[PDB]
């Protein structure tokens, strides 16, 4: 969504 979108960036 917004912060659940940012989860992908955090992981990778």
């Amino acid at each position: 969504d917004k912060n659940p979108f940012k989860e992908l960036k955090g992981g990778c």
Side-chain angles (χ1 to χ4, degrees):
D1 296 295
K2 292 298 290 75
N3 295 284
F5 154 61
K6 197 62 182 180
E7 203 283 295
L8 289 297
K9 290 183 169 176
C12 295

